[PDB]
Structure formats: structure tokens, C-alpha cells
Amino acid sequence: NYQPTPEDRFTFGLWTVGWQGRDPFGDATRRALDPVESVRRLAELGAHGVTFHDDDLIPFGSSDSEREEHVKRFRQALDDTGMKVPMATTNLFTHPVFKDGGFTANDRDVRRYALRKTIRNIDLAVELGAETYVAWGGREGAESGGAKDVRDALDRMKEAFDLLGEYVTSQGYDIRFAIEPKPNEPRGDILLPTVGHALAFIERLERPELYGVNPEVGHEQMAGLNFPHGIAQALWAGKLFHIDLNGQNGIKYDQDLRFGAGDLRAAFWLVDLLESAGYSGPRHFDFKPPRTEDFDGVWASAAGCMRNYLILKERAAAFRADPEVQEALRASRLDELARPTAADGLQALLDDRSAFEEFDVDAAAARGMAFERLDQLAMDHLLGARG
Amino acid sequence: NYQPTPEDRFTFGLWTVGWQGRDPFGDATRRALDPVESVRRLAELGAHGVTFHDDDLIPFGSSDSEREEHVKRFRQALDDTGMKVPMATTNLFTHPVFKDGGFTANDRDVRRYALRKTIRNIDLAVELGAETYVAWGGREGAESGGAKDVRDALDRMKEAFDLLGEYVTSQGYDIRFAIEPKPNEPRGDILLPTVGHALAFIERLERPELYGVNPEVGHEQMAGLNFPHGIAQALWAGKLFHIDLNGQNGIKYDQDLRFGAGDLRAAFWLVDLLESAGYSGPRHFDFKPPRTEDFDGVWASAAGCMRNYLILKERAAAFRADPEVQEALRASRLDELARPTAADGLQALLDDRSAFEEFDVDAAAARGMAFERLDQLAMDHLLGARG
Amino acid sequence: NYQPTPEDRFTFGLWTVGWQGRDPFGDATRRALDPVESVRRLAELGAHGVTFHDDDLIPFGSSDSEREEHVKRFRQALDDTGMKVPMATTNLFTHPVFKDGGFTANDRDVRRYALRKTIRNIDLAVELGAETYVAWGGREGAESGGAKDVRDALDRMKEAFDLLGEYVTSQGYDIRFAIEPKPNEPRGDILLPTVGHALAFIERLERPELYGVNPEVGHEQMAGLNFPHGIAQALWAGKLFHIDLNGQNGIKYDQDLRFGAGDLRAAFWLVDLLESAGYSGPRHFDFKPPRTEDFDGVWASAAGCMRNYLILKERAAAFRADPEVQEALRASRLDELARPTAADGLQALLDDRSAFEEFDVDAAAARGMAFERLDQLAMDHLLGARG
Amino acid sequence: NYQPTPEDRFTFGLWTVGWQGRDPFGDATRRALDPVESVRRLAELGAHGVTFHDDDLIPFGSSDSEREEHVKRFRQALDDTGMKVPMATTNLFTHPVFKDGGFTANDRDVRRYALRKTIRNIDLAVELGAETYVAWGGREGAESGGAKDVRDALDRMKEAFDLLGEYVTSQGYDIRFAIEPKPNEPRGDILLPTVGHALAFIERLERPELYGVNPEVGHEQMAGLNFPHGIAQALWAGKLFHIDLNGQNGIKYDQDLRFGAGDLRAAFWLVDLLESAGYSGPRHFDFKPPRTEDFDGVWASAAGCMRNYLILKERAAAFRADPEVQEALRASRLDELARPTAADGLQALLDDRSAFEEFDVDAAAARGMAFERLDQLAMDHLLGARG
Ligand SMILES: [Co+2]
Ligand SMILES: [Co+2]
Ligand SMILES: [Co+2]
Ligand SMILES: [Co+2]
Ligand SMILES: [Co+2]
Ligand SMILES: [Co+2]
Ligand SMILES: [Co+2]
Ligand SMILES: [Co+2]
């Protein structure tokens, strides 16, 4: 009953299931997990792949023999489980050397060290088999108005991203970059807060075909925006390379709950938008199990994310495959929305007398749009109570 | 004492001072104002120009003789006061024919009527002397997830904006377009909610040099974002053609208070950013006086906006012209932020041994950034208590 | 299929279905409705009763003959439909004489006029058969910090509510009062913003057994709080006399959507809390149909509110009547939450050695709470996918 | 220049200046501070006293000899500095045994252990000389709707607070209790989120004269409410026993910035309300220095909190002592707000013909309130630009 399979492209993170529960008012409630154990339990649950930070796989300040031993043990775990790695990311936020930032720091040697650590993790990501890179700007911001010059910081972020694009062009890899936006937490105001700010940063670079977005449901719900509107703008731009699925209960701190929890209707319209657009990337869950749970609660939340995605996929397919719903879609003129406005020309629009001169504004205004009947049909197909 | 002058480019709107106080739980508390009286009182207060909707100047469904009589009376008022018109906008939100939207509606004749009304107001705006056009997407959105298809709606908005750009290219005018973002109110989720979403829409058009943004302090503070960060990203893109100044007390409804009220520190850093960048456009106040006030309170709020801008301009100039502040700026390494990261090359960065191999992360992490001393100097220069 | 009946106590408002669609950026999209027509269509839909403002039933400044003609026509409509009136409220927000407030105004004659209008509407409410009175503080607040003295305003609100309690004690009626909280809109900061602020105001009055709360789902979701937590605190205090059900999509303006839309999981836990506590009052829907809809969309939204309540009542009863859910409730120690902490005494708690001295904090901390398995069971019972 | 003195009652916390900078995306950036060193540096800065958690002073699981050695060293530091202890609090949130909660937990032995730890810290607080106790409900809440029964949890919180009141009544101490509200972080929905919810909990207890509130500026600004409105309701109830002063930049995570930063106008009206009401308690700063700062930045922020309070005290006294401001206060009818509404009686109000019959609503509605001129006078007295 709603059993996940590796053909559904369900991927998880190592920091998701390996989170020890350290919130800033409490200590850790769970022990540290082996990545081999995490890969084997995610293979028993039915996932497709795992993602990793560099500090999640290899600990900080270790030797090259311990680095290649960790890479060999992780490669033996992936070869015995059959799982892939579709995405990797870097850690530029945990260490106190990155307390002002990574690529946009006030120290040039800290900026060069973050670039060198990023280039080493890109080499490890291509060596492990990833095809998407994610650069989350965690510490890139300020707590006051005079702590960062924002135009110079966008110049240094453009210089660092063009250096990474020049490095992958010179090595000839097939990896592509993704930018993960967030409005705040841990900084007061994180640079590029939204998907649109990330896309406007992407269209100013030198090689803009290698950069996309990695949006998050929770990170766009802390700004109070609409996540199907952001995903549909990113798909209209053709730049959605990766996605992150979690839950959020409104404008607050980053909770990172399981998928389906929080805004269930927005998750339903997100799953309906991805199934109607045909997004063929990985389905990544960047979530956190709560610190009141044990490891059985961790794997129960990891099963519940995939179960909620399969239930919402079945409800969205049953919503879109219905003749009464298609009659309500024809009654709400959404097929006339798909028609072009003026395909006859600008001179034909200026010479058409029925657009301004004989247009009846009262007869066009006394026409119901019937959106509430379609929304009640969507609510009945979501809850399963159809007559 | 802080007397405004027309060289300071202070502009207002007709709907700002002519607001009758109709909120959705109450009736109107003031009578309708004459635009001639509004232009003469704003000339006595010391403004530079006025802006207008088409429905603010000429009422709906009137004749051409009453239209040219209103244009002749407004032109006689501008010729006797000496004020200009730097900006005009259209009204696609008040009438019930635009209850689904203007350029992105589900009715093709409503879309063509909104385009024809926009072209007629562009002809009136060039005839009156404006050089910036503002298209605010007021009703462009939905209250449910299935009421709009967002990719087709962005296709129709791209088609309508390319038709307006083709019209001003064919007539050969010197006017430029501006897009005013808003997250919500009156719709549940308004398309292009932020400045970054507007810039990402601007970089997908066919002639992108004629389109910019018209951001608002309140409209970016209902999303919980940072308005100097948005204005600095719009100035880094080179697309800030117009601005709107008001106040807002957090994530709530659109209050549209006077300038200085609300986030005083964010208004101070906004005035400091505009004075350091040298923005030479109009200083427009899109504000609303409250409905508890009379007309003396309306002109007191209109004087208080310009007085708050001149006081914040003096405090920002006294903040930037100070040797102890410049010593704190050198101590916070913001001159090293202005230096480039790797101007020696990618191969020089990969061969530089001091970036990764002999980089001391503990000695680079045990260095204070001293942002709080600079923020206390900014607070002392804001409040005037300097020792 | 989920047909409503008058035994389910479903009540509506006259201003709900009679809303003409006047938002503050647009005009009215619908004509004015007859209250006789609204009562007859709500009787055909299956409601139990209607509520009214005084200005919704009798227009402002009319004669006593037109007042008794409107009362006679409304009484003939109620006698031919069989519907009741369980609740009435007053209008102290639409007229421009109440632009500073009603009971807490800066004018003593305006305060006395609001008290006299409230006493006349209480006499009409007892004459029509209501048993609950609602006093919504619409305009009771300020836009600046120096426009109201808040302690003197709470003194005048206490004086006005004690005068209304003295009036209903002197007339000997059986009506009870309810206070409806709201954080903002139309004022910047409305006095008594939450249910807890209303309860803390209720416990300072002279006759506190005649005052309760009338909370709203949307009005507590504009503050970002938890509405089952507020309803459970109001039921723990024993003061929940009335309720208002609508929808809201987060911290924004007051949308007043239909029930079920917005936070569906919070609506599910609200319906589960009311069905487990046994709240026997009216089920009132203070909602607004959108201005894109016609009258068929208005009655479709009015049917969809009752259909969503009956579907959530069936899902909450199927959630609570389940042995696997009861086993998860026993595993999550919520039966041990219902046990008292120290029923043996304070000296027995201080002399009990197993509370502090031999208490094993590691063995008590290494115990999973299993909340995620219970929340997945609640999500499966909400969506109907149970194996 | 604005030098603080111990007669101004400026108090700090040990966890404020001893915060190591551990946010949930990063590690610690500073070493652990000695409390003797913190008391001596706060005495050199000019504070009046220090507050403490029990885990801040004595570490967890230590012996009684190390406990009395820490108490003897802290007592020698207080005797050599001359500083007091006005307030103490307990730690029921850091350890993983309190991951579900303290007083409202699902485990009875965890509830009894939290009560015994609270009684031991009350004995240490009376032994050190404190007169106010603060019980912050950090972990008292849930992440889902079925994880806590809220009425049973309020019953157990009432039982635990009545047990603490019975303990201080039986020992005969002069200490009083304070409840610190917070909406969320670290839980999803913390029980008693606001000051009004805490006051409504206080008025249900058995001995309600020993319980008050300890509100925070940031904790009431994460709910989007008005903190002078909450402090004025707590002073109208007569229950403000303690206060916490910090800063917050809107509805987000708990930043805990320095005082004056964030909402400067709301901090100005808060300082004006405390100086006009005559609050004679301690002025406590529950703030966090940022992790980019060193120890000189920590003591610079600790000096800047007291400097911002003294500057706002001088500006509020200069605002209230002004004849033009008093003329605007008489013009805005705030002396008529202080007059009672109906001191002649209910029968005199019902027989007064000038309240309803000869009341001119148009002449009372065509009267300006002149709030914007008073708010401009308050802005000019805040910024110091007075003519
Ligand atoms: Co997240
Ligand atoms: Co993520
Ligand atoms: Co606005
Ligand atoms: Co504007
Ligand atoms: Co409402
Ligand atoms: Co209501
Ligand atoms: Co705090
Ligand atoms: Co605190």
C-alpha cells in the first residue's frame, strides 16, 4: 500500500536522517549515525539515492588516508546497496572561520579558502558520480545595515560563481550548479532571499546556462510567498534543476518538517504542478525529524515523506483525470487563458473596434468566474469524498 | 528649518492626497479633492511634481469634451504652478471588469480592453510630459491553486509587455516602463511578488532595456524582506528607474503610512544607500493619510514626509562624513570587501599554497568583526547623541 | 451525500452572503441582497439560523415605521422558514462618526452614542430571540504610539461593558456577551488582540459570569498563533460561548475564506477538539465569498462550508474510533498526561527519593515519544488512505 | 556622556554575556566565560545586578562540594563588586530529559524531577538574595495537533504552579513568581504564547497575588503584536513584576539583539510608558551578542544597551515636558479620554436626550483628530530636530 520504488527517484540527505537534534536551546538527543547504516536503511526503506555535505562524509581536519578510507567505505556501501548520488553540496556555515560568510566575506583569504574547499568538493562530487551541485548561501548576509556593502558582495559572489564555472569548463565536467535561497536564519537578512532574486542573479553571470535554482517549500514559506507560483516561474524560466521538499507552519523559524505536514493544499498543488509539467529530476527531502523521536521515528518520518508524495500523486492524477473537473475548467475559461491575446498584430489590435469602442464593460463584468466550485472539486478530490 | 525645495525632486500622487478614507470596514471620511487644488497646495508645500492614474484625472465613461476639459484644466494648473509630471500609471483594478485581472485575465476581450486602455493612457502620459510609466499588477493572481495557470499567465504578461514595447518603439517615444511588485492584497497571491521576481521577468522579454522596477518600502516589508537589499540588487542590475516611499509596521496589510514612520532604521539605511549610489530619479511618496485626519492633517503628513527625508539625508551625510566612523569601517574590513577575490587567475588560485594548505583556520576564526561598534556609531549618528 | 440538517446547528451571517465585494482597491461586483431572500436560500441550503448587524437589517437614519416594517418582514421570513436567530451584533465601525472608536473614543458624546446604539440593538436582539451578544472592537486602537492612552482606554471599555451588564441585569434578560478579538485591520493595533487578552479583560470586570469570547480562525491566524490551543484555553477557562469559522492562508490581511480552505490540518484538529469537548453552541461561518463569483458561487461556498465541516467531523470520528490509534495514544503516554503529577502531597514529593536522588536522567532521556507515527496515522485518517 | 549608574537598576544575565555563539547551523565562536569575570566586567561597565540559571552557575551532575565552592566564589565576587541578584530562573530546556517539557510532560517522573529541581533552585535563589522568580516555559508545547492534550497540560501546569506557591507559602519566603511567554522556537506552538494568555492563566490559580508576567520585546514581536499595548495591559492588571529588553526585526526567529536595535519607535514608546507609569523594578537585558564579535564587542553591546536606554529616557522626558506637545495633546482630546464616560448613571444615560436623539453625527464626524501632527512632534523629539 503506496510502496515506494527506486523508479520514483526518491532521494534523501545524510544530514536529514543523521541529525542529532541540536536546536539552540537544547543538547543532542540522538547518537551520531554511520553513513553506511544510513545508506543501508534508506535502501531497505526504498529510496533511490543519497546526498551529502563534505563535512557529513569526511570530518574536519582529517588525514588523506582517513579521507580515502571514508570514500572507500561509502563507495562499498553504494555498490552493495545499488543507490546513486545525484547531488552534492558543500559546508560553508558550521565552522567559525565562516562566521561572516563564505564567498562574500570581508576577508580575502577566507574567500579564497572557501573557493578552494568548494573546488575540492566539486572534484569529490564528480568522482562519486553527482550531476548537480548545490551552493547554499548560509552565512551570506548581515545583522545590521552597515555590516555589508551589498553591491560589492554581489560582485564577489558573481566573481566566485564565474570562477567555479570557469573551473568546470576547464575540467570539462557535466555537473551543473544550483543556488538554494533562504530569507534569514542564521543571519538577519540572507543575500538572494527568494527564487526570483536567485534567478535575477543567474541572468547577470557570464555563462548562465550552467546555473539554476534549488528551492525549498519551507524556505519560501518563511517569506510568506506561494511555492507553486515560485516553482512555476522557475519552470517558465527553464531553470529548475533540483528541488527540496519539507513542511512549514507559517512565517516562523525553519522547522524542516516532513512532507505533507504544514500546508497540505500547497503541497497538493505543488505535486500537481510537478506531475503536469513533467519534472524529471530527483525528489529530495531536506527535512528534520524532531528531537523527541528515536531512530524508529526517524525511519517512520522517512517512510511518511514518500507515502505522502505517493498519496498526493494519486489524488492529483485523479483530480486531473475527471470529466466534471474538465467541465469546470472549461467553465472557468482556463482554456481561453491558454489562447494568445493578440496573435493578429498590434495594428489589428489598434484597428479592432470591439476591443475599446463597442466593448460592453457591464456585460463583461456581470459574468461569474466559478472558481469556488472548482476549488470545492479540488478539495473533494483531495479528501477523497467524491459523489 | 528643513524646508523642501523643487531641486530635491519631491513628487506626490493624486490618489495619495485625494484619498477619501474608504477602508473595507468603513465609509469615506473626507470629500473628493480637486486636482487643481491638490497641485496648488502641493506647490505651496514645496513639491516638484505630481503623478496620476487615468481614472484619478478623467472619470470613467465620460465624453471626449469633458476629457479635454479636464486635461486643459490640469495643464493650466501645471502652467500656473510650474510643477512637472515625471510619472503616470494606469487603473486596472477599480472597475469590476478587472476582477480577475488586466493583462493576465481568463477573458481575451478583457485582456484586449486592458491593452487598449493602457495604450490610450500612454498617449496621454507622453502628451502631458511623463518619462516613466508604471504598470502595477493589482489584480494579477488567484485565491486558489487551480484558478490560474501561472506559466500561461506569465506568457500572456510577456505578450502584453512586448506589445507595449512594440507600441512605444513604433511611435518612437522616450518613455520607459516600470513594474511595481506586491505579494498580496487584494488577491491572495499576486504574480511577481518581489523585486527579484520582477527582475527575472524583465530578463525574459525581447527588448529588456526599456523595463525596470518601481519598488515600495511597504510592499517589500509585507514580505518580510530587506528593502536596502532589494534596492541594492536593483541598482546592481542597473534597473532602478523609479521608487515609492512609505511606511509599514511589519508583516500585515498594506498600511501606506508616511515616510519615516515604521522602520526608521531601514528608512535611514535606504536614504544612505540612495545618497551613496547617487539615484537621480524622482522621490515619490505613495502614502495614505489616515481617515481620522482632516485636510490639515493631510498636508501635515505631506510636509512630514519631505521633512523626514531631509532629516535622514542630513543624518546619513553626517554619518558618512566622520573620521571615527571611517576608522571603524577600516576596522570592519569593508575596504577589503571592495577588493576582488582572485584577480591573479584560476590557475594562480589553484597553485596558491596559502589559500588551503598553510591557511590557519583558528587564527582566522579568532578575529572579531566589530560590527556592533559600527552599529552603535550609526545609532548615535541617527539619534544625534555624539560625544 | 454529507447533506446538512438543522440539528447540526449551522448558522450564517447576513453580511457574509450579502457582501457586495467592496475591497479597498475595487468597487462592488454584486447587487445588494434581500434578507428575506437570504433567509429563504439559507433555509433551502439547510442552515439552522442567521445572525445580523443592526445596520444589515435596518439602514442608517431611517424612520421607526420603516424600522418596524423591516422587523415585520424579517419576522415573517423567519416564521415561514422556521429558522432561528441565535446571535446578534452591533455596527460600530462603518460610519465616519466611529473613526476613532466606539466604546474607547476620545469624544464622550461619541462614547455615549455608541452605548445608546448598543442598548437599542440589545433590545432588538432580545425582541427577535437571540441569546448571545457579540461586541467586536473594530475601531478600538491607534496607528501611532501617542494617539491612545491604553490604560484609560481599558478603563473606558471596562466602564462601558459594566454599563451593558448593569443594563441586562436591570432588565432581567437571559442574553450573554461575547468579545471578538482581532490583532489589526482596519486599525494598526487593535486593543485586546488575542483570546487570552480578551480573557484577561474578562477577569477584571465586576460581573464576570456574563462575558465570554467569540474567537475566529482567521483572526487568530493573522497573529500566527494556534487556534486549537486558543479554543482549548477558552474551554479550560469555561468561557467559549460562540465561535466563528473561516479560512486564512497565513500572516496577511483578513481574507475570510470558506471553511476547510487555508489550514486544513488545523481545521481538522479544531473539529476534533470541538467534537471531543462537546461544544453545544452554534456553528457560525463568518466568511466572505470572493468578488469574482456570482450568487451561484455564493451559495456554492455556503454549501461547501457545511460539507467541509461534515467531512472533517466524519474523519475526526473515524480517527478517534480506532484501536491502532488508541495503541499509539497509549504508546505516546497521553493517558499518563491525564494522570495528576503529585496527588500524594508536597511533603510526599519532597520526601520521595525517586524524584531527584535515584532518578535516572539518561534512561528517561533515551525514550522515544513516537509522535510522528501518531501524526502519520492522523494524516492517513485525514486523507482516507488507511491500510 | 550618558554614563550608567547603579541607581538606574540596570541588570544583565549570565547567559547573555556568556553566550558562546552556538546557533543551530554553526559551532561556538567564543570560549566559556567565568561568572566572576562577568560580574567584575559588568561592575566596571556600571550595572546593578546579575541574573542566573542554575545550570549557568553550577554545572550539571556535579558534587555538593563543587556546588558550594561555586556558590562561595560567586558570593565572594558579589561581595567584592557590590552587585545584587534581583532575579533567578531555572533551566528546564537544555537537557534531553526535558525534550517533551518540564511541568507539562507526558512522564510523571520527569514532571516530579522538574518540580524538585525547581524547588532546589528556589532555595538557592532565596539563599543568594533574589526576590523574583522566573519560570520560562521553553519546551512546553507540541509540533503536531495530537501530541499534547492542551486542557490536561494546563491542568498539570496549574498543579505545578500551585505546588510551588504552596512551597513558598509553607517556607514563608518573600519571593514572587513570573511567567515568561513565547509563541514558538524551540517547539512549534509553545503553551501560553502571549502576555494575555499568561494573565488568563494567572487568574485561574488558587493564590493569584504571587504570580505575574516577565514579558520580552522580541518574544512579543515574533507574534506581531504591540509591546507597549501588552505592557500597558499588564500594568492595568497590576501584574508587571519584571521585564526583559532586547530587539527584534519582525516576525522571524528569536534574534535577541541589543536594545534600541530593531523597532526604535516602539522602544521609544516603551521607555515613555515605563517612565510615565513609574515602574520601579529591574531593567533586565535578555540579549545575545552576535557570533561575529569578540569579547570587546560583547562589552560594547552591553554598554550600548544602557546608553540606548538613557538616550531614550532623555528623549521621552523632553517629549513629555513640552508646551507645544501639551497643546497638541489637548487638541487630540486625550484629556477627554481620561474623563469617565457615564459618571451620572445608567438611568441618566438612558434619559439623556443629547446622546442619541439630538446627537449630530455629521458634525461629530467632520472633526479632525490631529494625530499626525502629534506623531510628527514625537518623531522630531525622537530625532532631536526641534525648531
Ligand atoms: Co529548511
Ligand atoms: Co535545503
Ligand atoms: Co502600498
Ligand atoms: Co506604489
Ligand atoms: Co475575519
Ligand atoms: Co467574526
Ligand atoms: Co528572546
Ligand atoms: Co527572556
Side-chain angles (χ1 to χ4, degrees), chain B residues 20-21 25-30 291-292, chain C residues 60 91-101 110 139, chain D residues 361-362 364-367 369:
Chain B
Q20 285 171 70
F25 301 101
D27 281 353
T29 64
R30 272 178 304 246
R291 73 200 290 273
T292 73
Chain C
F60 204 88
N91 185 274
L92 301 178
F93 47 88
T94 318
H95 209 270
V97 75
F98 301 127
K99 58 183 200 263
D100 202 20
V110 169
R139 306 252 164 216
Chain D
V361 286
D362 294 334
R367 278 212 313 258
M369 297 304 294

Side-chain angles (χ1 to χ4, degrees), chain A residues 135-199:
Chain A
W136 175 50
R139 306 252 164 216
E140 310 299 326
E143 280 86 41
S144 52
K148 288 289 186 181
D149 187 78
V150 186
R151 291 176 279 151
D152 286 335
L154 286 172
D155 273 307
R156 298 296 96 79
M157 191 184 285
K158 182 201 187 305
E159 176 182 3
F161 269 121
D162 276 307
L163 272 168
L164 293 173
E166 197 187 357
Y167 178 67
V168 300
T169 304
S170 69
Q171 299 275 270
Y173 298 148
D174 277 296
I175 201 168
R176 289 184 316 186
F177 292 101
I179 302 160
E180 178 174 354
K182 203 180 185 186
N184 49 5
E185 187 190 353
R187 317 294 316 261
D189 285 301
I190 291 178
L191 295 195
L192 317 175
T194 74
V195 179
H197 293 76
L199 282 177

Side-chain angles (χ1 to χ4, degrees), chain C residues 98-117:
Chain C
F98 301 127
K99 58 183 200 263
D100 202 20
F103 303 136
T104 81
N106 291 342
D107 295 317
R108 189 174 179 267
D109 43 357
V110 169
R111 285 190 305 246
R112 283 171 86 100
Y113 172 69
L115 274 176
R116 282 291 303 257
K117 193 185 189 264

Side-chain angles (χ1 to χ4, degrees), chain C residues 99 189 203 226 367, chain D residues 99 189 203-204 226 367:
Chain C
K99 58 183 200 263
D189 285 301
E203 298 285 332
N226 198 278
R367 278 212 313 258
Chain D
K99 58 183 200 263
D189 285 301
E203 298 285 332
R204 271 298 166 272
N226 198 278
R367 278 212 313 258

